[PDB]
Amino acid sequence: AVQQNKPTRSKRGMRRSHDALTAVTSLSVDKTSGEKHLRHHITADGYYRGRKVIAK
Amino acid sequence: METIAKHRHARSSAQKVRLVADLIRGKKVSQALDILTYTNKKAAVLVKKVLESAIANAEHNDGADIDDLKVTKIFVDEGPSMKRIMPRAKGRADRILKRTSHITVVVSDR
RNA sequence: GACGACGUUGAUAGGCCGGGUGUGUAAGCGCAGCGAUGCGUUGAGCUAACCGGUACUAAUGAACCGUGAGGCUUAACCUU
RNA sequence: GUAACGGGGCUAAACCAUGCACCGAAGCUGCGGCAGCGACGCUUAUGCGUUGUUGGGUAGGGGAGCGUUCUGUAAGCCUGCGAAGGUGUGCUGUGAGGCAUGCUGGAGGUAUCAGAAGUGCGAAUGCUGACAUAAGUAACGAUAAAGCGGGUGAAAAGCCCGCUCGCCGGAAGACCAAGGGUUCCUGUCCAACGUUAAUCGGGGCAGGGUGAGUCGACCCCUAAGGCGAGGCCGAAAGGCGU
RNA sequence: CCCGGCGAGGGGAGUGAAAAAGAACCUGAAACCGUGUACGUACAAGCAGUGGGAGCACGCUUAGGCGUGUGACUGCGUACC
RNA sequence: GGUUAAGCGACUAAGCGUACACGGUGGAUGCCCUGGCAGUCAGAGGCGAUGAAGGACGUGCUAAUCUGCGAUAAGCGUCGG
């Protein structure tokens, strides 16, 4: 139920070796607006594949 | 030449913030800003704010250029903690800690 | 986490078309009866995960990682 | 789980008798150093030339020392040309220790020989403060339930407005006593407080709000019971009662 | 004066002998938590040290084969009260 | 120099350990005293129905608390310094 000995700081780091997160490898560029956006996502200005989706 | 910006007494544990900090170490400022924009963490907003301030300081005080800057150093330090009381069952009381941290960003033309 | 299929030079998922299956004669209108109801149109209407088909909708051009002929010694071979 | 030579493995690497070599301890010898106790040189305020011999150790007895704070010596001596304290390096004694010096620090420190003690910490489920571990794990308090448009804003699943959906309805609606004591209304702010965010709040700050001859209290009258002039009783205090 | 939400918190300028004396303020030790550099570590079993010891890095040196950090491999070794 | 075969063999660090340099957290140590402790030599040994000890509420150019004061309310008359 509870520990019998105090784990060391070395053990704590070992368990934490899989906690690192990964950044986005790359992001797309719109064909018409020219701004950067996530792939398969709407741009900040409301463009998508140079079609000018609703930007309300 | 090196420029420094800090944010002290931030409401977040050092362990949580350190995850974001390791993501942009050694990268260029232009690339670093893009990475922080598309990270879904609260600490990303805090770190991005500090990095922008450091960039502004370079131009006004040192007259540097954006194209030549990169994140030379970055680290997070623990700050003071706040003590609180949380009632539990059967009349027992517990202690709660609300940790803070210090964020430092160094940008240089190296 | 992993593993398998597919991304327009395309049937991967939804929708749509036809069929099957289940339930058991819809609504509207007409007729008989004082009325509750019955009868005709009618095995009618509706129908999830199933079967056979179909580019109507979504699967974007790119970008990123990974390189540039691959150590030394000895023997037999190229030149048994 | 081989499990009745420690293991390989051995027909000698087994057993009996005889002989000669070698390995093997902090035992013995060789070389250098320290200390205790004896006798001798009658040396010597005692150290030696010598000279023999001894030196594991709990309870416990005997002998000799280091360092810390305070008083005299001290109206002395060191110090802004850098004191105490903190942190490194070099040298030195058998030990507790001592000496010099770089950096930090920015005003006190103290020889020698004597004197006096709140004089030395790892343990007592010791006392007070600070910080770890489990761990970014459990949990976020009734399974009555939410969806979308517009507005404000640095930022909206939670705030404001509108249209739908769901729940209580002898209450989860309305008015009071007891108790609490500004939580009531308006403007403004988001650090802390709210188990998340917050532009919102019973949160922070400032201003405003409670109008009685008839409602209630006070007031007149008494129940249980309390107090009680004289009085009766009891060491004192005090008890009962008209 | 500049970044930020007319924020919080910072970077310059200025004052002062000193701002690493900035109001969370003299001196600023330890536990505990981080960034940078050198060396070691993914076929090896146990109080983590001790004796021996290769290689690498670095400072010296009239190469004087020494000093400092690290420690592959190997003998012995079951904390304290 | 080429092909094949056999033997041998550096460069990896997701993370971790030791040493050194520079920081964070925390408030020990040194220095400091308008506070305490123990005495000596002198005082005075009581206050109150002429309303006490101790309190409530008020009082300023004044929102709060402390000190003083009492509707004559951080004060009034007189005699001296």
Swiss-Prot record, chain B:
Record-level GO BP terms: assembly of large subunit precursor of preribosome; cytoplasmic translation; cytosolic ribosome assembly; response to antibiotic; ribosome assembly; translation
Oligomeric and partner information: Part of the 50S ribosomal subunit. In TnaC-stalled ribosomes forms part of the binding pocket for L-Trp with the leader peptide and uL4.
Effect seen on changing residue 93 to S/T/V: Abolishes translation elongation arrest of SecM
An MF annotation (GO) of this entry: large ribosomal subunit rRNA binding
Binding site for L-tryptophan: 90
Note in the entry: The wild-type allele (erythromycin sensitive) is dominant over the resistant allele, and is also dominant over the temperature-sensitive allele at both low and high temperatures.
InterPro entries per UniProt: Ribosomal_uL22 (IPR001063), Ribosomal_uL22_bac/chlpt-type (IPR005727), Ribosomal_uL22_bac/org-type (IPR047867), Ribosomal_uL22_CS (IPR018260), Ribosomal_uL22_sf (IPR036394)
Family classification: Belongs to the universal ribosomal protein uL22 family.
Protein keywords: Antibiotic resistance, Ribonucleoprotein, Ribosomal protein, RNA-binding, rRNA-binding
Record function comment: This protein binds specifically to 23S rRNA; its binding is stimulated by other ribosomal proteins, e.g. uL4, bL17, and bL20. It is important during the early stages of 50S assembly. It makes multiple contacts with different domains of the 23S rRNA in the assembled 50S subunit and ribosome.
Effect of substituting residue 8 to C: In strain: SK1048; decreases translational rate, tRNA binding and subunit association at 44 degrees Celsius; does not alter 23S rRNA or uL4 interactions; not erythromycin resistant
Protein name (Swiss-Prot/TrEMBL): Large ribosomal subunit protein uL22
TM helices/strands, residue ranges: none
Superkingdom: Bacteria
GO CC term (a single one): cytosol
